[PDB]
């Protein structure tokens, strides 16, 4: 989530005074090239480097990846609601997240670099195979990066992290 290890150089700049979603690219600044769903959405030649996806009220979504002088970085699944991507399902105040890769192994989940869904002592947090359910969703507290990985693998080895921002 916070670390860019694993080619996950795409991060959300959560320092916007307005409800605009700003994305940052962790690459050696020479020229920043941005992609959206594999298709390039812009090319920043020095100067500015953050990519504006517009107001967060527009529910921006897609797989955005950046590229400097090296190869393109790993994708960052954006899911705003105010390769197979992670599946987000919202029912009332309940949000369900699905691991894109479910080889049938014990899939572990992490939210803001903190494991979640392991202990059963949380009634509002349940894990069912590759399905992560979040009841009574808090917009300010549970939003952020999410990543799923089978037990044994590294979270940084995931193909992409899911940044969830939903107002329920």
């Amino acid at each position: 989530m916070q670390s860019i290890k694993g080619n996950h150089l795409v991060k959300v700049y959560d320092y916007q005074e307005d409800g605009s979603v700003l994305l940052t690219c962790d690459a050696e600044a020479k020229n920043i090239t941005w992609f959206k769903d594999g298709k390039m959405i812009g090319f920043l030649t020095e100067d500015k480097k953050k990519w504006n996806l517009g107001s967060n009220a527009k529910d921006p979504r897609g797989m955005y990846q950046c590229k400097g002088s090296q190869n393109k970085s790993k994708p960052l699944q954006v899911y705003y609601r105010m390769q197979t991507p992670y599946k987000v399902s919202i029912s009332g105040t309940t949000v369900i997240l699905t691991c894109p890769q479910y080889p049938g192994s014990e899939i572990l989940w992490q939210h803001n670099d903190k494991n979640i869904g392991g202990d059963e002592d949380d009634k509002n947090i349940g894990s069912d195979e590759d399905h992560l359910s979040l009841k009574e969703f808090s917009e300010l507290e549970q939003s952020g990066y999410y990543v799923c990985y089978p037990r044994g693998s590294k979270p940084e080895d995931a193909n992409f992290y899911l940044y969830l921002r939903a107002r329920v």
Partner: single-chain antibody, 467 residues
Framework: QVQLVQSGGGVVQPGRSLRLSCKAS????????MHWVRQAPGKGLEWIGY????????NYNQKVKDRFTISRDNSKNTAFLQMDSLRPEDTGVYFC????????????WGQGTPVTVSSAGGGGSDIVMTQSPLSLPVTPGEPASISCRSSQNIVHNNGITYLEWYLQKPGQSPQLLIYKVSDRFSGVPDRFSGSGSGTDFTLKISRVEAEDVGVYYCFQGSHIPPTFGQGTKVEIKQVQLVQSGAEVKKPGASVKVSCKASGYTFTSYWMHWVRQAPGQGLEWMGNIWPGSGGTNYAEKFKNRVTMTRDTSISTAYMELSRLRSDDTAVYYCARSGGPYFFDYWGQGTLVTVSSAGGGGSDIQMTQSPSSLSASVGDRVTITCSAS?????MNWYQQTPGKAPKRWIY???KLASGVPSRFSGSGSGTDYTFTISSLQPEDIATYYC?????????FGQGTKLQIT
């Protein structure tokens, strides 16, 4: 000291079930995933699966998912491996390993439990009926003689040498030729004849014609489990039971082979169901008296197969569940006769079972060299190639007769107690394990393991020796 203890193994007959126990000590059992690795004789480590003691979630290899059951007892800190319908291919050492999620390696390995799936089904039941010739070719019109020897004396309490030598013409149901020790079945010409006593028996074709072509498989009816012999395929130097149609399933599934009966009273003759494995001899599997539904299943499938009857329709179904790769065969449906077994046989429905095999899917680990001889002090380099990019590789050392011990984790991190002379290097699908100075204590098998995706893939292993 963290300790994993494997228990519950032993020698069992093919098809029997075994329950193993893996007690965990020295750590909180629920905090680390418990994994089982099977080490067959002469083969590399085969990751079977893992079970999460805290959540109860289980993962398994597709090959044994339909025959193995992994369970955990948090109150006992013991992991259990319940194996159903054990076959000879499952014979080997099974070891318990504690999975370190942060270290991305099974850090603690149990001493292992040896399993051998060989008991001759109680001994006499597996009356190995070795046929003296094998695929012996004969020109036409010659006094052929095919002899078969019986592992035990082929003499039942009733004294009738329930021995027979059935012919199987190419692409046809096997037919019975010698109904007793030397007689001939109706319609079986006098051209073929036989003789024998005790454990020695022989089948002779004084005149051999184009009809005589085929493979002659000898049944042995004295032993409670009927057992066809290996088979010599002779070469060149009404009532009809209709079988069902051919079907191909995927591993672990179920096939229901049907046999419609006409021409005889259905509820008056036992319907034994023999199965002829490709590249193997016939083996009886079980019977069902069409009236009373009673089943007598054999050992080799005693916990996988179910035979049903529909007397209303004069038909019988035999559902073999949890289909495995090596169960693929044509389950010919016979009717075991009065003084002769397997008299008139049906067409038989071929059923082939195999999955993708993960040739390009399951990441494959290729280690080079497989065996290396070096002097003490020479720099030893072992390569491990992955069929797909792996984020990290795990290196394990397994002493002969000892459990594998992790040597390198994270593809570069040496575990506690590992001398600095060992090093792992590489990324993705190319990894190297280097011993800068080989030592006399370093003689062992080194295996590289990929853990990016289940099931865990281990290399073929590099046997390092000191010249």
């Amino acid at each position: 000291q963290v300790q994993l203890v494997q228990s519950g193994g032993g020698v069992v007959q093919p098809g029997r079930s075994l329950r193993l126990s893996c007690k965990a000590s020295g750590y909180t059992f629920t905090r680390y995933t418990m994994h089982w690795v099977r080490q067959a004789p002469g083969k590399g480590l085969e990751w079977i699966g893992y079970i999460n003691p805290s959540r109860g979630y289980t993962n398994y290899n597709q090959k044994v998912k339909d025959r193995f059951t992994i369970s955990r007892d948090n109150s006992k800190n013991t992991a259990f491996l319940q194996m159903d319908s054990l076959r000879p291919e499952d014979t080997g050492v099974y070891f318990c390993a504690r999975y370190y999620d942060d270290h991305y390696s099974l850090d603690y390995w149990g001493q292992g439990t040896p399993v051998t799936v060989s008991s001759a089904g109680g001994g006499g039941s597996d009356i190995v009926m070795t046929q003296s010739p094998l695929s012996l070719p004969v020109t036409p019109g010659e006094p052929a003689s095919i002899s078969c020897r019986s592992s035990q004396n082929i003499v039942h309490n009733n004294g009738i040498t329930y021995l027979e030598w059935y012919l199987q013409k190419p692409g046809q149901s096997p037919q019975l030729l010698i109904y007793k020790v030397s007689d001939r079945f109706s319609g079986v010409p006098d051209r073929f004849s036989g003789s024998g006593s005790g454990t020695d028996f022989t089948l002779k074709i004084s005149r051999v014609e184009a009809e005589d072509v085929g493979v002659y498989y000898c049944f042995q009816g004295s032993h409670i489990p009927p057992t066809f012999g290996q088979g010599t395929k002779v070469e060149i130097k009404q009532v009809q039971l209709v079988q069902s149609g051919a079907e191909v399933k995927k591993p672990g599934a179920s096939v229901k082979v049907s046999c419609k009966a006409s021409g005889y009273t259905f509820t008056s003759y036992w319907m034994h169901w023999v199965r002829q494995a490709p590249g193997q001899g016939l083996e009886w599997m079980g019977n069902i008296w069409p009236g009373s539904g009673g089943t007598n299943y054999a050992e080799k499938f005693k916990n996988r197969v179910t035979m049903t009857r529909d007397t209303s329709i004069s038909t019988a179904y035999m559902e073999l569940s949890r289909l495995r790769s090596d169960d693929t065969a044509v389950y010919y449906c016979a009717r075991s006769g009065g003084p002769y077994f397997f008299d008139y046989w049906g067409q038989g429905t071929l059923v082939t079972v195999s999955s993708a095999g993960g040739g390009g899917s399951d990441i494959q680990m290729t280690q080079s060299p497989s065996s290396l001889s070096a002097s003490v002090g020479d720099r030893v380099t072992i390569t491990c190639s992955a069929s797909s990019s792996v984020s990290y590789m795990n290196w394990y050392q397994q002493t002969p007769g000892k459990a594998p011990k992790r040597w390198i984790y994270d593809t570069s991190k040496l575990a506690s107690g590992v001398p600095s002379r060992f090093s792992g290097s590489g990324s993705g699908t190319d990894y190297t394990f280097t011993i800068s100075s080989l030592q006399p204590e370093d003689i062992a098998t080194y295996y590289c393991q990929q853990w990016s995706s289940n099931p865990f893939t281990f290399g073929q292993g590099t046997k390092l020796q000191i010249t």
